[PDB]
Amino acid sequence: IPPIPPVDFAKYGEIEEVPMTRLMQIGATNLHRSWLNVPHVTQFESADITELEAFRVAQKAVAEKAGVKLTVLPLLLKACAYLLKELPDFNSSLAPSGQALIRKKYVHIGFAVDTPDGLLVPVIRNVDQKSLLQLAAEAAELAEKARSKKLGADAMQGACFTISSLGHIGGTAFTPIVNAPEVAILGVSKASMQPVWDGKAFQPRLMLPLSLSYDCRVINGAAAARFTKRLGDLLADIRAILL
Amino acid sequence: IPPIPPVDFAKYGEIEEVPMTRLMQIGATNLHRSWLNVPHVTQFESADITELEAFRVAQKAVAEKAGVKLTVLPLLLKACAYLLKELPDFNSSLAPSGQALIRKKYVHIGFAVDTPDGLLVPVIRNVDQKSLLQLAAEAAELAEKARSKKLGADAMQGACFTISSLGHIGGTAFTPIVNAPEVAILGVSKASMQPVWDGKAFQPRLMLPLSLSYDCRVINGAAAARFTKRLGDLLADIRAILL
Amino acid sequence: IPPIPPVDFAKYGEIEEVPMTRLMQIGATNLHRSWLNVPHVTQFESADITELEAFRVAQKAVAEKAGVKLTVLPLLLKACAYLLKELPDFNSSLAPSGQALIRKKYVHIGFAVDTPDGLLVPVIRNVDQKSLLQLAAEAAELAEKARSKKLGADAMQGACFTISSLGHIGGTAFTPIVNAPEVAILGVSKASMQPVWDGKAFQPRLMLPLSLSYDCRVINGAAAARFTKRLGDLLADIRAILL
Known part of the structure; x- marks a missing residue:
């Protein structure tokens, strides 16, 4: 790939060099x-x-x-x-x-935690078998160990999918990068009250912006529109998971 | 390009290998x-x-x-x-x-059809000379031959532009990839009723999300904003094509 | 990078070759x-x-x-x-x-001007020290010299950040490309009246679409959501700059 030409940044004013943590470089x-x-x-x-x-x-x-x-x-x-x-x-x-595609028969999902030293993505194993409060406890623990540098490399491995939630800071949508070798990542942004047409008038519904990036060698455009559509359907009534 | 490190996916659970159709690999x-x-x-x-x-x-x-x-x-x-x-x-x-740019004096346009074996993009030739019901018949035929593997390679060639419509499945917008050597592709998503300001109040108008990806070596940002703006103008009153 | 296979475009109809200005090729x-x-x-x-x-x-x-x-x-x-x-x-x-990151202690910002011969990005130096009408005069001058080919290469150098505004043509949002070695670029699209929830009803507020592209090796997702959130906050009340 052609490299970027070096610039003497100090010709234009005062500069200062801060270094990168190994975590940032990785x-x-x-x-x-x-x-x-x-x-x-x-x-x-x-x-x-x-x-x-x-x-x-x-x-x-x-x-x-x-x-x-x-x-x-x-x-x-x-x-x-x-x-x-x-x-x-x-x-x-x-x-x-x-x-070939290696289809995984397990579901472990990672979630982005942004710490001082860089971004970490802890993995919760067998998310499909745990309950809402179990997943809640586990997420919280892994996030804390991630911030406190106590997260052992074991827990950063073998994820199938990543969720990156920035809804707590803001934004309307973003385009996340797929953490290869996984094939998709779900970006989640800030929810806001939006007017939604009920067939007769606009009702305020609370809307969550979803941004699914995917590897289009493996997932084509229609399969991906169907995934965010099913996800929007499941979050509008989470009881559908029960059936 | 640095390759992606191989992972033994079976360390984390059961896996299964399905293969790719030659169509998917192409x-x-x-x-x-x-x-x-x-x-x-x-x-x-x-x-x-x-x-x-x-x-x-x-x-x-x-x-x-x-x-x-x-x-x-x-x-x-x-x-x-x-x-x-x-x-x-x-x-x-x-x-x-x-x-140099090779400017084409003809208009053939391809449209994405997603079939079981992969994505096909049949090409309708001289779209500029055909009528709404002619184009309707042709699109329908090519889509059927594409699904039934009866689409001869001839009809996948020499397109000038691609339209990829996912409005029938869902989604708010997406970022399509330009099928090089073409220089742009129009993604179309689901239409929904939106409140639009009439200068005095919000009126419900049916809104179609358009997503134009382009090759910015050839098309700069302003030329592209002007293309989606003219397109939005033409679809709001298709009679402008008559003049 | 694998090259794009050459196509004989003249097999499908009449073609014409126009050349690229050196500015476009650069x-x-x-x-x-x-x-x-x-x-x-x-x-x-x-x-x-x-x-x-x-x-x-x-x-x-x-x-x-x-x-x-x-x-x-x-x-x-x-x-x-x-x-x-x-x-x-x-x-x-x-x-x-x-x-390492070279942190600049100066603020010079470039802004995209699209001219006939191509895109130019003049740089205003020490934007942080100039006033609203000073910046207004300077922007206007540089834009004119850029259109009239009278912009000396000096003024295209050493920018820290780029703003690309297409609001005067149209569009809802776009994904600008970072002008490396800078680490971010702000795309600005057309403002429109939108219904915004006041806690009790939808009020029409004039909304400006912002699109921040960034180099995620240097800026992580949360730092970037916080930058567009602070920017949205500052533009909603520009008096916050005074304190």
Whole structure:
């Protein structure tokens, strides 16, 4: 790849050199390797979470009696796990021969935690078998160990899919980079009240912006629109997971 | 490009290998070749199609007496063909010498059809000379032959522009990949009723999300904002094509 | 990178070869070099500029008595300059060793001007020290010299950040390419009246679409959501710059 020409930045004013943590450099290398290896498309969608939000907030009591804080992430994890089982091409990697897909029969999902030293993505194993408060506890633990440098490399491995949630900071949508060898990543942004047509008038519904980046060698455009559509459907009524 | 490190996926659970159809592998190679060769920008816009939709629906009679189903795609094709003639840089390819553009004086447009074996993009020739019901019949035929493996390689060649419509499945917008050597591709997503300011109050207008990816070596940001703006203008009143 | 197979475009109809200006070829090379070197993510946001717009329009008198036209660009420049100082990682470049960031202690910002011969990005030096009408005059001058080929290469150098505004043509959002060695670029699209929930009803507020592309080796997803969030905050009340 043609390199970027060096510039003497000090010709234009005062500069200062700060160094990169090894964690940032590892991260830098991994993203650029994904970038050049995966042809990326982002599919955007927004889900109606008015009812999900009401549930979240009502179970604040239960969650606190169990010591966890029920946020939107355990709900996101549960729903993507159900869906990764319904649409198995999202739960696979491209074989090194380029001629086969390795479909995984397990569902472990990573989630982005941004710490001082860099971004870490802890992995929760067998998300499909854990409950909303179990996933809530685990997420919280892994996030804390990630911030406190106590996260052993074991827990950063063998994920099938990544969720990256920035809803707690802001933004309308973003285009995340697929953490290869996984084949998709779900970006989640800030929810806001939007007017939604009820067939007769605009009702305010709470809308969650979803941004699915995927590896289009493996997942074609229609399979991906169907994944964010099913996800939007499941988050609008999470009871559909029960059937 | 640095390769992706191989992972033993079976350390984390049960895996299964399914293979790729040759069609998927061809597709995979073409997309990655486009990805590394074309610096991509997506320009998003949404067009007001309330009136277009009313027309579509009124001519259901005519369309059925002629045996075709008038969908939004013949209308999209007709309008982009008019525009590919008004803005000829969108109807060209970059010469192999990198120092010239080959401007095409013809308008053939491909459209994405997603079949079981992979994605196919049949090409309708001289879209600029065919009528709405002609284009409707042709699209329908090519889509059927594409699904039934009866599409001869002849019909996959020499397109000037691609339309990729996922509006029938869902989504708010996506970032399509330019099928090089073409220089742009129009992604179309699901139409929904949106509140639009009439200078005094919000009126519900039916809005179609447009996502124009382009090769920014050939098309600069302003030329592309002007293309989706003219397209939004033409779809809001398709009679402008008549003049 | 695998090359794109040559096609005989004249098999499908009449073609014509127009050549590229050296300016376009320079531009083409720079964008493709950025594309392959920088892993890109776009963060989207929209800012409430109802009040900013009212101010702009009230100071039409002052602006005209000073000979400049106060547009949204001097306001964008002032606010990003304040922010490039608050969040210094946005005002830096990656060292050639890949292991350090060169943080710049100066703020010069470039802005995209699209001319007949290609795109130029003049640089305004020390934007942080100039006032709204100063920046207004300077922008206008540089834009004119850029269109009239009288822009000396000196003024295209040593920028820290780029603003690319297409709001005057149209569009909902786009994904700009980072002009490496800079680490971010702000795309600005067309403002429109949107319904925004006041906690009780939807109020029409004038909304400006912001599209921040960044180099995710240097800037992680959360730092970027926080930059467009602070920017949206500053444009909703530009008096916050005063404190």
